[PDB]
Design a protein around this ligand. Structure first.
Ligand SMILES: Nc1nc2c(c(=O)[nH]1)N=C(COP(=O)(O)OP(=O)(O)O)CN2
Length: 282
C-alpha cells in the first residue's frame, strides 16, 4: 500500500517506526517558546538517524489529569517545530493535534499525516482535515483520556472497536475524505483495562478486513507497566515485545519512544515475514 502526501509517497509494505516528539508547555520551555526549538530539531535528527520514518509532533499530553493547552500555545510550539523539520530533513511528519487551526496551519508548513487521537470530533476538525486533503488516523477512545476514571465495561471490546471504525470511516467519506486516506488505530490504553488491551493486541491481525493501514501506539504504557509492575523507565523490553507481536500481525506503523531499539526489532521481523509464505501471522 502507499500513502501520498505533500508531493511524496510512503510505502507501507514494510513497517515504519514513528518517533515521538512531544512539544508541550511544560517541556518546550518557558513562557512562550524557547531555544527549546534547537532541542526539538536535534531530537528529530537523532530519531531520523535511529531510522524513524515518521515523526509525530504533538503539543498536548493525554495522560490522566493532563492540562488543557490553548490554540496559541499549540500554534507557538507545534508549527515552528513542524516547519523547521520539513525544511531540514526528508522525513514524514504527523501532527498530533485536535484543533482545526493547528490542522490548517500544519498543512501549510509541510506536515504529512493528521494524527488526531480524538478522531476529528471537535467542532470544525473534520472539514479542516478535509480541505487539507492529507491522510488522517482514526483512533478508538472510550471516555476522556485525561481523567482519573476507571475503565469501561465492554460487552466485547473487539466488536466495539470494530463498530467504531465502521462508523468513523463513513463519517469521513461523507465529509469528503476518501477511504483511501484513512489509517485505523485501536487506541491501546484509551478507555481499556489490561485484559481489554491484550485481547485487542491478540486479535490485531483481524482489523485487516477494512483494508486500511493499521497504526499502533503501545510504547511505555500501563498495559506493560501493570503487567510487569515496573516504572516508566523500566518498560523497554515489554514495549519491544508489543512492537514485534503487532508487526508480526502486519501493523503498518508503530509509534514509539525508543526508536533505535524498535527499528532494530523491525528489521528482524522483516527478515522473518519475508521468508514467511503469506507474510503475516494470525
Ligand atoms: N495514533 C496514536 N496517537 C497517540 C497514541 C496512540 O495510541 N495512537 N497514544 C498516545 C499516548 O499519549 P501520552 O500523552 O500518553 O504519551 P506519549 O506521547 O509519550 O506516548 C498519544 N498519541
Amino acid at each position: 500500500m502507499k500513502l501520498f502526501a505533500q508531493g511524496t509517497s510512503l510505502d507501507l509494505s514494510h513497517p515504519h517506526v514513528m518517533g515521538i516528539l512531544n512539544v508541550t508547555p511544560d517541556s518546550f520551555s518557558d513562557g512562550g517558546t524557547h531555544n527549546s526549538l534547537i532541542d526539538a530539531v536535534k531530537h528529530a535528527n537523532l530519531m531520523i538517524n535511529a531510522g524513524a520514518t515518521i515523526i509525530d509532533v504533538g503539543g498536548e499530553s493525554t495522560r490522566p489529569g493532563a492540562a488543557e493547552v490553548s490554540v496559541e500555545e499549540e500554534l507557538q510550539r507545534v508549527i515552528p517545530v513542524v516547519e523547521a523539520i520539513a525544511q531540514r530533513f526528508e522525513v514524514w511528519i504527523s501532527v498530533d493535534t485536535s484543533k482545526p487551526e493547528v490542522i490548517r496551519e500544519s498543512a501549510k508548513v509541510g506536515a504529512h499525516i493528521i494524527n488526531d487521537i480524538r478522531s476529528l470530533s471537535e467542532p470544525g476538525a473534520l472539514e479542516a482535515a478535509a480541505e487539507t486533503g492529507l491522510p488522517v488516523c482514526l483512533m478508538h477512545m472510550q471516555g476522556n483520556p485525561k481523567t482519573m476514571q476507571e475503565a469501561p465495561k465492554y460487552d466485547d471490546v473487539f466488536a466495539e472497536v470494530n463498530r467504531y471504525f465502521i462508523e468513523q470511516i463513513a463519517r469521513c467519506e461523507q465529509a469528503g475524505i476518501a477511504k483511501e486516506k484513512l489509517l485505523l488505530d485501536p487506541g491501546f490504553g484509551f478507555g481499556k483495562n489490561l485484559s481489554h488491551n491484550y485481547s485487542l493486541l491478540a486479535r490485531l491481525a483481524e482489523f485487516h478486513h477494512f483494508n486500511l493501514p493499521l497504526l499502533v501506539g503501545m510504547s511505555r504504557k500501563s498495559m506493560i507497566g501493570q503487567l510487569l509492575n515496573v516504572g516508566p523507565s523500566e518498560r523497554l523490553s515489554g514495549s519491544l515485545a508489543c512492537a514485534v507481536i503487532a508487526a508480526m500481525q502486519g501493523a503498518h506503523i508503530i509509534r514509539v519512544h525508543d526508536v533505535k531499539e524498535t527499528v532494530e526489532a523491525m528489521r528482524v521481523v522483516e527478515a522473518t515475514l519475508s521468508a514467511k509464505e503469506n507474510k503475516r501471522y494470525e
